[PDB]
Amino acid sequence: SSFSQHARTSGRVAVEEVDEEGKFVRLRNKSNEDQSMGNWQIKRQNGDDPLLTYRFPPKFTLKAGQVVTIWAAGAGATHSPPTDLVWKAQNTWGCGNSLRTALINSTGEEVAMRKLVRS
DNA sequence: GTCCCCCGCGTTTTAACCGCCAAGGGGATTACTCCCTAGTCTCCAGGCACGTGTCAGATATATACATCCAGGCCTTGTGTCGCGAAATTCATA
Numbered sequence A: 001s002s003f004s005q006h007a008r009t010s011g012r013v014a015v016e017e018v019d020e021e022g023k024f025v026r027l028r029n030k031s032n033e034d035q036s037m038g039n040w041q042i043k044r045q046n047g048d049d050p051l052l053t054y055r056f057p058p059k060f061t062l063k064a065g066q067v068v069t070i071w072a073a074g075a076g077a078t079h080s081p082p083t084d085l086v087w088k089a090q091n092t093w094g095c096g097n098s099l100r101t102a103l104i105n106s107t108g109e110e111v112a113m114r115k116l117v118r119s
Numbered sequence B: 001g002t003c004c005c006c007c008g009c010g011t012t013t014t015a016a017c018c019g020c021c022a023a024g025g026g027g028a029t030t031a032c033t034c035c036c037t038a039g040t041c042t043c044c045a046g047g048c049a050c051g052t053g054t055c056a057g058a059t060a061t062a063t064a065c066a067t068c069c070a071g072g073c074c075t076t077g078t079g080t081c082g083c084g085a086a087a088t089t090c091a092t093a
Helices: none
Strands: A004-009 A013-018 A024-029 A041-046 A052-055 A067-072 A084-087 A098-104 A110-117
Touching: A004 A013, A013 A098, A013 A110
Parallel strands: A067 A084
Antiparallel strands: A004 A110, A013 A024, A024 A067, A041 A052, A041 A098, A098 A110
8 A cells, every 4th residue: 555554542532544645534433432522633744744733623522433534625525423524624634655643632632643654 | 652659758646665563363273072974784676788669860852932134114315417597708789
């Protein structure tokens, strides 16, 4: 796939899938309990590109075993909570050989991260 | 990676203990008595040895009841394409 994926998780939510073209960001709650992700921050790093910061609404909770996918403006997807959300303020999550998607909670702590590395 | 929670250290508490006091409870000892049972015999019947009958579970089968599985059925997201609504560009009165 030419993009190595590094998965690390210390909480309940893991970064399930990252789009190489930056169309969407997919996270998974692999525990057996619902995770409240109110005002959690998603920071996307594309190599040396400036950070794109996405902020969730003040009250948001992902049910256990459910999938929420954050789509970009250029993707053309339709938001449908609690499973589908679209970030119209950003045309695309970006591209590059070093794509890093870090999930930041409301306390500014990194609990999940997945990095796409291409030789 | 997360986090929290003993660890080490400094400050307050406070009783551990060595010492001194006394009582006395009873443990140990001794003299006294008393009686319980091993020992002896006598006698006898109760549990072992043996044998035998016969049914509880081994053996076997057939059956009603709990489980995996899917097909049918209803509600919902997809696709479509002719035409309204907007602009456009120019012929011409």
